[PDB]
Amino acid sequence: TCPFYKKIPGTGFTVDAFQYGVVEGCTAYFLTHFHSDHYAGLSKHFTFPVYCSEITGNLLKNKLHVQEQYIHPLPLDTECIVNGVKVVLLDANHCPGAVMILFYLPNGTVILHTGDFRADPSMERSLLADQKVHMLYLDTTYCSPEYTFPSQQEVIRFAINTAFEAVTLNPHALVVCGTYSIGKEKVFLAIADVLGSKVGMSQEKYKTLQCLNIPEINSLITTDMCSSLVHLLPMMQINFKGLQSHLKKCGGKYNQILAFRPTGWTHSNKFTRIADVIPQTKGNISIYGIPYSEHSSYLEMKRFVQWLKPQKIIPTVNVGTWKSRSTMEKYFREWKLEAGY
């Protein structure tokens, strides 16, 4: 049955609640982004209204075959009316088409649901600045002080410099990047741009990327693997066996692989600077795990909440254990006492 933290009080609305069958009293189902833990349950047989971003709506139609008459895309940063309630969609700085949702309840309560997000000071100047928020449904993925990670910009600099150096030293090296959902496209696109190559990939993955409104995408991606020196493979294949096998398939065009696994966090972060990251190597294969996160660090999350000053926080992640829940509630209290709300 649907958990309380997916229900918006005082409306007929749910958020990211598609795996519970027909939710009792739900008149409109919102989807914050196209990741499988959130969309789980949607298909061509869904006949309730789905409200989402334009990009998420492209993906529902093309990848899951949801019928167009039930997809209701909304523009960002625009006040819209849904079943008599004002809503706004804001950029979540997660994966393409990911949004936060502001709901303006008829009785005066204002609720922000972050979906999945990576908090950023740029958010402190959207339509959020313009009113008070009473309840925050918060993406608490990394809500513990051990979770520090570098900026996205520092991580991409490291990747670009690493790949450019390797291929310049050996023009017969192949770069591989792992993927299993949308998100983190900058990793493979920045590397291909510095190498003067397109990124080669499966037809299924190319179709997925063509749904995303990325400008100049016909310019950066391709299904012709033979013309590309940056290949995308499933994340599961980014290991020594999987990569040895791929290299065999390239028919002696290449004699070395440099591979990237963009992870969220890895406890190498508690000891190591980005500058200091080294690969795992076997033979002519090296694998770099890089800490490219599309969720808030603890400090980014804390700054956002201490700026917003909500009256009540409802965590949406790590809510399944009493120890996790208790830990998070203790940090929320600290934040509030330190800031004075």
Ligand code: NI
């Ligand atoms: Ni997500």
